Amino acid sequence: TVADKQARLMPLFKHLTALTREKLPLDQRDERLKGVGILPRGTLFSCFHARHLAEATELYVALYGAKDFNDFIHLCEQARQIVNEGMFVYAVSVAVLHREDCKGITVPPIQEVFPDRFVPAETINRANKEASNHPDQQSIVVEAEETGNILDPEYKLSYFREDIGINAHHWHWHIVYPATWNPTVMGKEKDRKGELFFYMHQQMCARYDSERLSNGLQRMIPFHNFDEPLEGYAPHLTSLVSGLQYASRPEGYSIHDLSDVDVQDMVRWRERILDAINMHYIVDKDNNKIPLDIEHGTDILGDIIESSDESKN
Amino acid sequence: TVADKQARLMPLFKHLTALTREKLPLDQRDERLKGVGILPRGTLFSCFHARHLAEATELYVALYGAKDFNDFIHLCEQARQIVNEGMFVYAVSVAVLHREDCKGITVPPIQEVFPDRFVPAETINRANKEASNHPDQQSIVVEAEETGNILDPEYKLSYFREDIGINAHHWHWHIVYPATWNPTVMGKEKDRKGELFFYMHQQMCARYDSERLSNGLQRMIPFHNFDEPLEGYAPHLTSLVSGLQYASRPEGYSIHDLSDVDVQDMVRWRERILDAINMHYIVDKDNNKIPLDIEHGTDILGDIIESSDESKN
């Protein structure tokens, strides 16, 4: 039944961190699996980076490809052993969302699956400590609120920024509209995904601005210049997988090139986009021009800007 | 014979400087050079600069144009007296290489023609000094190796960088494939010169990198950012022809516009080139687009990048 199906899915989601240790004599048998497994388990998975996204896409496809739900569970069970866990959650969630066979099925809570992302280093540590401190069946309760000196006014916004629901939503939205989404492979297409990308993010900003004003703060200003130094932020999140945590960002240094990408790469792309707007057309790979139609324009721009697989160039 | 022809060309080039003193009472006399007559003798000749290259090209053409070898010697003889010497060596070498009257005419070895470029000033003026110090037929021998505190690890690479053979090769290669080369005028074309330009330089870098690693040094990093200050280098080379020497450069100052060109323009040219590579086509003067074909692409790029006369734009 559906209920049974739900039960099977929940365990795909359990003890992801632990699920590592491949226990696989050979991947060769898993021909389907050959494509994935580049990213190491412990490593952090990036939703944004292209290479990471590529692996993720490869994983989803296998899941989509799965002939039946049972087959789906099997490959998933096996894949989860090798692949980086973050990528795994990402690929599986996408599969659950789209794949018909999964006409059954919620995904386990993101907050619940990775509590460490939702709550601070202290209350993670506390609940772990209490667990060890006195063994007992008894329940442990920890109040995350803390006691601290409130130095930055940005702190006021924390109710909005830190909110569990907001973070969860953002995770889910990207799952429904993956950047990697290839309509040919799935066959189905996500209507107006580029435009939606634009709208959803715009709303988040708009909503954010309302908070600042409620706060008595001015509206947020854009990252209009790349040269400017960034404000620092320390998340105080320790990623349970690892002993490592998300690195905090101290105050103020201009932007640094990464091996993967340059800054004048970045800037150039921005001018291209802003130019093509002005010209009212964008150039496809074919070197044909497509007009930024009133109907189509936002969608086309969304794909290019994000950018999705859908980007015309 | 051809070897007797050698014996004349070599003393044509022998001691360039003192064969100047134009010694033709009226400037108009050489209408043959009324188009040029811009860069004086003593001045340093730039292989890279466009204006210098233009003069050089003009010279070669005259040499190519020479009806016969005897005519070739004549114009060369007389032209050498008036033109800058560096340009002269450049133009003549190109002529010798291509012009059918010249097979089996090697050029005077570059190192031998301009010993000052190959060896340090100290062994130039020591040797000159010994010549004056005691007049005697006896031979003079000077060991260039020196003795000095070797503060910079870059010094280790000197065996590679300073090598006489390497420098000579680089000189010769540019002669075989001149940037100025105009296929219409010569009639013949240099096959895949643009690609060769790319390959030869790439190899020099690759070979260089192997030296650094042999040294235990990391691979060289590209000068991507125009803003960054350069490392200094002092050549310790003198130009006997005059008092002058190649100016040394210390490190630590960002890049300066020249009257001839501004750095900003350089950046432009790069973004221009990158775009073309990206959209897979380049724009010709005609404003037609030529594709960066798999076969053709490197060659077309080479001409544009260097850039040669061949550049499409």
Curated annotation (Swiss-Prot), chains A, B:
The keyword Membrane does not apply. Three disulfide bonds are present. One of its GO terms (molecular function) is copper ion binding. It comes from the Eukaryota. Keywords: Copper, Disulfide bond, Metal-binding, Oxygen transport, Phosphoprotein, Secreted, Transport. It is found in: Secreted, Extracellular space. The keyword Cytoplasm does not apply. Hemolymph. Cu cation 1 binds at residues 170, 174, 201. GO terms for cellular component: extracellular region. Its main location: secreted. The two copper ions bound each have 3 nitrogen ligands (presumably contributed by His residues) and share a bridging ligand (possibly contributed by a Tyr residue) in addition to binding oxygen. Hemocyanins are copper-containing oxygen carriers occurring freely dissolved in the hemolymph of many mollusks and arthropods. Scorpion hemocyanin is a 24-chain polymer with 8 different chains identified, assembled in hexameric substructures. Belongs to the tyrosinase family. Hemocyanin subfamily. This is Hemocyanin AA6 chain. It comes from Androctonus australis. The chain holds residues 1 to 313 of 626 of the full protein.
